[PDB]
């Protein structure tokens, strides 16, 4: 049977391929169709019956099954700047992801509460991986979730006013019937079987 | 002030950073607002005056200014397979990108013509970078435009029945009023400078 997934974009790109590798590896010839996007768009997709499973970010309201999956944390990245305080004075441009989720407002709030000022809006982008690439090309600094980071060329954790890392969840949503279907069960399996680490 | 761009995804990821790096290097503190996506979506967004400039792949019809930018060529990539004839038997999955552009149709047509059979619709993905990533993780093989490839990690040129590389074009689009703006002209300048490299 054919598994129809809706995955948030950064998840689709960075976390899911190891998941799908093992899923393909123990279930040869099993079909997978994958749509990606903003959590909001994939939630809306899931709701309207287009997919079996949604892998959504944030805190989606959902009246079916919802599995917490994981949590990651916000990092400021730049090629030059090594000290997060420096960004208050920086003239290096700020490369901001903005969508309809809370991501953007969370960062605006952290910034307002950390530096007692507004961040300069210069570069606005609508997808997170683009912000990452533009940061990796030295254009400016970005704030990315650690699920999108590796041994790439400076990463500085965001901590709130009480020294706590911020702060973002990934869930697995779906209605009951989907979890009745088998390949969904083998996929949820592979996920929870993988996460054993 | 404030350039509003709409850019096909792989361009946004792989080619545009270079260009924005220079655009910023040359005009510090110039505001840039970027949206990304399928070529059809970015053309729509441009058609509706939501942006200044669109960068669009394929062969868009356009009753305004259209500049050809570049061509790139299709490669079959896989971690195991070295020889592109084998792909007709391998039973490794074909990770296949599919949108409402003609990318998919054109690869289908090539497949049918070259191998005289059909390809196995197992994995279907809605963004190209995810095919790349899924291919880089050994899941299966992918057909990717070279604008998304580097000295990476096994690539075999797609050639039509008369041994000519199969290509895809990328264009820059706008209506005349946009091209009168100093920031659109500066951006276009950085672009037409960069194409000589
Ligand atoms: Na969203
Ligand atoms: Na940077
Ligand atoms: Na399109
Ligand atoms: Na493809």
UniProtKB/TrEMBL annotation, chains A, B:
Transmembrane feature ranges: none
Keyword set includes rRNA-binding: no
GO molecular function: DNA-binding transcription factor activity; transcription cis-regulatory region binding
Keywords annotated in UniProt: DNA-binding, Transcription, Transcription regulation
Family listed: Belongs to the LysR transcriptional regulatory family.
Protein name stated in the entry: LysR family transcriptional regulator
Organism: Bacillus velezensis (strain DSM 23117 / BGSC 10A6 / LMG 26770 / FZB42) (Bacillus amyloliquefaciens subsp. plantarum)
Full-sequence range covered: 91 to 289 of 293
């Amino acid at each position: 049977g054919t598994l129809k997934l809706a995955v948030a974009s950064i998840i689709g790109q960075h976390w899911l391929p190891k998941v799908l590798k093992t899923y393909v590896e123990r279930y040869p010839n099993a079909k997978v169709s994958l749509i990606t996007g903003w959590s909001s768009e994939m939630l809306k997709s899931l709701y309207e019956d287009q997919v079996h499973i949604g892998i959504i970010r944030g805190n989606p309201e959902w009246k079916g099954r919802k599995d917490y999956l994981m949590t990651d944390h916000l990092y400021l990245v730049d090629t030059e700047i090594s000290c997060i305080d420096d960004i208050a004075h920086t003239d290096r441009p700020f490369i901001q992801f903005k969508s309809d989720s809370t991501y953007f407002q969370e960062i605006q709030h952290w910034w307002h509460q950390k530096f007692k000022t507004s961040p300069k809006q210069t570069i606005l982008v609508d997808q997170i991986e683009t912000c990452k690439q533009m940061a990796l090309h030295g254009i400016g600094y970005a704030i990315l979730p650690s699920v999108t980071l590796e041994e790439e060329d400076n990463k500085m954790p965001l901590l709130d006013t009480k020294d706590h890392p911020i702060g973002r969840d990934t869930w697995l949503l779906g209605y009951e019937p989907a979890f009745e279907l088998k390949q969904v069960q083998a996929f949820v399996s592979v996920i929870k079987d993988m996460l054993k680490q």
